[PDB]
């Protein structure tokens, strides 16, 4: 009954909304704005680099959660035009479940120093 406005996975915020429209009395309606921040509390600052300090300040601007970095198609009077619905289009507070985060480290192996590539989130990082 509550539609979903945002489902951000870089900062893990999930704004939903629902008009509870009182048919009894005419202009006392209740729009709701449930927000569901999850604070990772164990993650680094540069999350793709495990040498950074712990993240201790989490700043959530709603204009930067809600943004749409995806183009759209609009029918303008005969045509289909493509549009850029953004105006602002970063640091990430959580990893994404469906995304592969690696980090290159310098292991030695004998007479060389090979830049091998580890996997910070395994099971999202398998090749197919």
């Amino acid at each position: 009954e509550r539609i979903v406005l945002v489902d951000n996975k870089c900062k893990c915020a999930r704004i939903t909304s629902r008009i509870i429209r009182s048919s009894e009395d005419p202009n006392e309606d209740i729009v709701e704005r449930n927000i569901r921040i999850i604070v990772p509390l164990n993650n680094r600052e540069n999350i793709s680099d495990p040498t950074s300090p712990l993240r201790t300040r989490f700043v959530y601007h709603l204009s930067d959660l809600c943004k749409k970095c995806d183009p759209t198609e609009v029918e303008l009077d005969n045509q289909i035009v493509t549009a850029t619905q953004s105006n602002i289009c970063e640091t990430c507070y959580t990893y994404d479940r469906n995304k592969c985060y690696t980090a290159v480290v310098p292991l030695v192996y004998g007479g060389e120093t090979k830049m091998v590539e580890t996997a910070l989130t395994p099971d999202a990082c398998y090749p197919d």
Partner: protein, 223 residues
């Protein structure tokens, strides 16, 4: 007698890809023996047919020479003074893109319960030319249903940027029900040449917020 060379209109360069360059010649007393010549005319033919005074001449074309940027010159000659006038145009560099903002109704109008006013402000763009279309749902409204002002220059002592507003008055039960209204702003400095903001009653100014902060240590995946 002077000579001006105007730019392609934005409605036609953007939705239609026509870059018809107009060359007007104003300051004529009697003569209909004007003559135009276009130096990057690789075949296309100008027109004539002067009203009352001025003489116009439109060189046709498509947007691919104009968007690539080319120097079009309208060398005009008349039988009043034997030197010819010249004029040159190209696509203007130093462009900024608009910052489209779509503003909800004021609460005065929603409590009056009759018709509410959605405002579209586009701001900070460098050429004077912009297109503001409006949509309801996804059906484009007819242009006699909204007011759109001109593109004036906003005050700053630095760069020269412009701004335009647009007003759509919709039904109060139509807003209060909850369908979406879009303002689409097209400008030649935008990457895909069009931006499109969309607002309804859910996507602006609630009357109850419930923030729910979930602290958890073993996190950092966002399932």
């Amino acid at each position: 007698p002077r000579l001006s060379l105007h730019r392609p209109a934005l409605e036609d360069l953007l939705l239609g890809s026509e870059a018809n360059l107009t060359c007007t010649l104003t300051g004529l007393r009697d003569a209909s023996g004007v003559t135009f010549t276009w130096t990057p005319s690789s075949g296309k033919s100008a027109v004539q047919g002067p009203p009352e005074y001025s003489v116009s001449s439109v060189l046709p074309g498509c947007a691919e020479p104009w968007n690539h940027g080319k120097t079009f010159t309208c060398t005009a000659a008349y039988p009043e003074s034997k030197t010819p006038l010249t004029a040159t145009l190209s696509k203007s560099g130093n462009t900024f893109r608009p910052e489209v903002h779509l503003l909800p109704p004021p609460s005065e109008e929603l409590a009056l319960n009759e018709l509410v006013t959605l405002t579209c402000l586009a701001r900070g763009f460098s050429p004077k030319d912009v297109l503001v279309r409006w949509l309801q749902g996804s059906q484009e409204l007819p242009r006699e249903k909204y007011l759109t002002w001109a593109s004036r220059q906003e005050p700053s002592q630095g760069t020269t940027t412009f701004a335009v507003t647009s007003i759509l008055r919709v039904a109060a039960e139509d807003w209060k029900k909850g369908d979406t209204f879009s303002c689409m702003v097209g400008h030649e400095a935008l990457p895909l040449a069009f931006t499109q903001k969309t607002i309804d009653r859910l996507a602006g100014k609630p009357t109850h917020v419930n923030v729910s902060v979930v602290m958890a240590e073993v996190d950092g995946t966002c399932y």
